[PDB]
Amino acid sequence: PIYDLIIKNGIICTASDIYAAEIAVNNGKVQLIAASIDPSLGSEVIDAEGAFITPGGIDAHVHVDEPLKLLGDVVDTMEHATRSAVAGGTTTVVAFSTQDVSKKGPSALAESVKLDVDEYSEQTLYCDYGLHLILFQIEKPSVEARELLDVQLQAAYNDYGVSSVKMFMTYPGLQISDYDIMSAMYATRKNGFTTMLHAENGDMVKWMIEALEEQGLTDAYYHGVSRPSIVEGEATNRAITLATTMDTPILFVHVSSPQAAEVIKQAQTKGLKVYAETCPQYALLSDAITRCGVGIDLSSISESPFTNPDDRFIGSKYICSPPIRPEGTQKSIWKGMNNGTFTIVGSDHCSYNYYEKTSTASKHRAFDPENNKNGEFRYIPNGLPGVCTRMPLLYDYGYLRGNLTSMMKLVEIQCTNPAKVYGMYPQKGSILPGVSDADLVIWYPDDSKKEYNSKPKLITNKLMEHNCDYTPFEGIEIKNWPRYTIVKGKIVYKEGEILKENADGKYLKRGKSFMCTPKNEWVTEWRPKYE
């Protein structure tokens, strides 16, 4: 026959279309869309039985264990994360390269990427992955700082196809000044990079943590109290101001604050190139879960402060940054996904064990009496596992339960926009004959009376296919799940089973994003020298 694979009787969903058609796949790529394709032309035929077919999900906010250990030891390798991703319908992930301050000169940032690529080249990869670069040390003063930095960004792009840079406005060791952000923006704009910011006011966070500890208020729940949404709002406002002065396109990661969403919306209405990301957890969970409706029935989650009130430390399962917000906030995150505030949705996947206490990758790492650590929220490793649950959670709580407008909005923010904003388009993100990698998800049919033994009813840890010992969504009902995950024209997940023999993932060299060319709009008569 002439094609490797034909998908029949399915409904194709893209960022802008929903329709019944059939797909042929060959040599790792989408080859054809047509009404009906002769089954004898394919080596393998999949009957979708009326189910939706979506592009594979693209999660551009994933944390994996890396050699510099910026977030300490993390339980998931690239092997584990990509396995988990695929079991949950995600077929591309983008992780983070930590700037290595021991490397100097023109190649310093390319050498930072090399550490990661070399490490992951020996692991079994279930899908493709890319890398963002994290920057936390910027040279001073600016006029030099901006010029050698320029050469370094070119080298990172030319050698490894990295075109995105991530910076922090909070966290000791990561927080950089406004002045240094401007220096970076100068370089990124010039090179057409995608500039990413974690926008919380680090000074306010630090002061409030100290004030809480002084009163002995150190339980997990006070992580939220130390940094209310007005702190994320202020910083996001300040960061927009910087981007405006510098005419530099900007993406805010994991937005959770209504105040932040407000200033982001206002900038987008003005036509400034301000992009935003949010995460399932900010729409589905509230901070009531950290101690003892448009989201998850919180009492249905198992192994939480509600079910285990004797365990005072169990709130740590849900500690992340920015914090899961108070009741009443979650609805404005859904509205943000529908109204255009959020360009993409990522997971902020970051995994630390709860049911083992001794390892360096345990949440209980917060207990270290010999290093003046006694379980205070300050010392809790921040993050939740989420790479597997991202796609099904939006399918269910978003599309089926009506919190997202349609399947097309789902695809737009989960698949196509991530590819576009991070320079993986059109190789990834869509279903384009002759062009797209054959990265596809076939779901189960929604309106069927037929029983599918392989379709899960609840989220469990075993279902995650990851290396962590818990998921925060443990025990909750889930109303659909990937029935097939196809990665580069091969079936890698089938009806609850991973097919390791079809794992052929590779590092992905990315291009410059067409969304991140500058507006050419300025506040004053000043222009950068190179203009």
Next chain:
Amino acid sequence: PIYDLIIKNGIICTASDIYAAEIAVNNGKVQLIAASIDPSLGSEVIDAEGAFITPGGIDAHVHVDEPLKLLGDVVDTMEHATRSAVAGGTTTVVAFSTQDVSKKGPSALAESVKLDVDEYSEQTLYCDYGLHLILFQIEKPSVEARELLDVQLQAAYNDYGVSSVKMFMTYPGLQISDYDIMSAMYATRKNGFTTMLHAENGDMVKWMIEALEEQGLTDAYYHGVSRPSIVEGEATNRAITLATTMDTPILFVHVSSPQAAEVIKQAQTKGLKVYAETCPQYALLSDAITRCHGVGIDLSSISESPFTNPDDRFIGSKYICSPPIRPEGTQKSIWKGMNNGTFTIVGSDHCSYNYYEKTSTASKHRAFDPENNKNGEFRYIPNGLPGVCTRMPLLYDYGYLRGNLTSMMKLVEIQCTNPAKVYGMYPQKGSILPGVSDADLVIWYPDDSKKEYNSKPKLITNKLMEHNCDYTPFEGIEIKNWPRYTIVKGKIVYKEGEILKENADGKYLKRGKSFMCTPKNEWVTEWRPKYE
């Protein structure tokens, strides 16, 4: 051969993708998309030479001559309008059926549509067309009326596939009170119709026109002065408030006011189902063009205007429409609205009256009728511009090529796909879907070519419009691309400047319920409609 038509070497543009691929067409529909299709498989092969291929344009705001003469006599029939559409890359138009106050009972609104369908069934149609229903007489009081109106909308949908209703907040004879709008919203929400509003405060317009005439300020330019942007803003705010109270999806037609755009955006941010339309003229023209004397058209390059003919005091009427073309500095707002999601769709508000003949009932000079106490005052000027032909090329050029729109995808979204979705013609129309889409396609000229194309026009002229009007307001301006092929239901109807009449086979279109116009189910108080 197995297929009627193959398009090779082109670049496919949809509402969310841009990519090089080839298309096969048979029996009026898109059959196949693939990297490369064997040319021996097609009866006809078109080499696109690297140019973009878009879906055909869908203009859901077109006015044609109709038997009840709501807008007086209009120069274009459905024959003329669809010919003009096709010459400009538009492959579906939606015009308007005037409520016939002489028909009574359950079938009264279906009977209104029948008048139009019957009349156009004898004309040569170059592409498909649908109809919106215009409502200006609502029965009172609301409760007792509910059954009849509800039953009437059902009959209009069941018999003629009409699923949209249009109402006016201005114009004597058309303006309806807030009370009556709520009665209509009650019925339309219940039937999943698309509710359309022209939102200008009619009372403010009426008062200010009388104030201006009292001072003798009657020239065409004072049309704009009689109804500044704050008037469109107020009424748009009022209409949103009504739609909110009634949990009814709403579309605002030809939005031109920054204040209107602002309250529209705020509602969209809240998640209310508020949609909006704008038109090329609100982004490209300013009111300076209505009397003698960088993001729009260079106004001095327009031929046959108050700039070139300052002797002709009435020539400003060529550019009189409602809402008015706005003062300098407003036009940029409209582009931003197209980019940031404020505007769901772009239509033309195509409405044609002759300028170079003065005697007929379809002339602009209709405003001169000494016996009916009419002496050229702006009040008597028939409102409207021809635009159905120029809509797609104007956005291609001044939008995509000149960088006022963000991408070709955004162009397709607002010009083709969203119009189909919001008015229940999707997926039959609006996209390029194998086995599903009517083969309605445009092949442009290649942008980056050094090759000469004798058939590619450099300027907009009246002759190029292929319409029945004797002017276009964009006469004389540079245009940097144009449809090279317009394919309608798998047949070539426009090729390189020539209309192919023998391939004209357009039909009336029965439309469905729009998936965008199901209600949000969100209310201001504990009250719910009886049927829920």
